[PDB]
Amino acid sequence: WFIRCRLPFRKDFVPFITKGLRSNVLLSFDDTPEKDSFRARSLKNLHLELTETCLDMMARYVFSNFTAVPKRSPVGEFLLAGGRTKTWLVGNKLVTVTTSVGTGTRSLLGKTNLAAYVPLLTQGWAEILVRRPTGNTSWLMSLENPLSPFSSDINNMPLQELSNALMAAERFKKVPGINPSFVFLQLYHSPFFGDESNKPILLPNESQ
């Protein structure tokens, strides 16, 4: 029903709903049954999981509706194919970050004078995909802050031959890329994290 419920006047019930929820957990257990309704910011374990899933679904479908299946456009795959990746568990949400290394471009070329810093060209693009109980959704991203004009060696980036290489590509018809860890650090580094549970966790990428 909350889905079939109109997009306008959808947030309205949200507190009442969780009120109606917290008023069903009145006396079953009250470890952390707090309101936490995002109207501010905008066994009984099974009961806790119930509340979790329901409010998560609402959050996923409040303010708009969207299918819970992501499918990246070919451009995204071309850009970040085999990209350097990293996934964390901030809380019950699963966050994943991926970073391109210009695979398809160097494919376009198939010369260190070019291939050495070819990925440096498109090293901006990235992709963040979050899987919650309500499904998974993602976004492609392009950082839009140019390199440090002097402290990040952008002058020694020969490009005329790169343009020549681009024309050739049109005719056809240490670490090689940035660290996706950066973006995640950016988007969550309140240095005095005031909730230990909220402290993000990096699952070890290598031990499969």
Binding site: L121, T122, G124, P149, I154, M157, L159, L162
Partner: protein, 48 residues
């Protein structure tokens, strides 16, 4: 309808793959132009 559809669909698939490769290279040409702009400012930073 099948005859019409295949006669159109061969060219469809070919030109669509073209359409694809063309757009990707056009997107790549933007990074080059941005680096050009920044290096232009770096150079243009000094006065004549």
């Amino acid at each position: 309808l099948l005859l019409s559809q295949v006669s159109q669909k061969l060219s469809n698939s070919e030109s669509v793959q073209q359409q694809m490769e063309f757009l990707n290279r056009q997107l790549l040409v933007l990074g080059e132009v941005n680096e050009l702009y920044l290096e232009q400012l770096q150079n243009k930073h000094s006065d004549t």
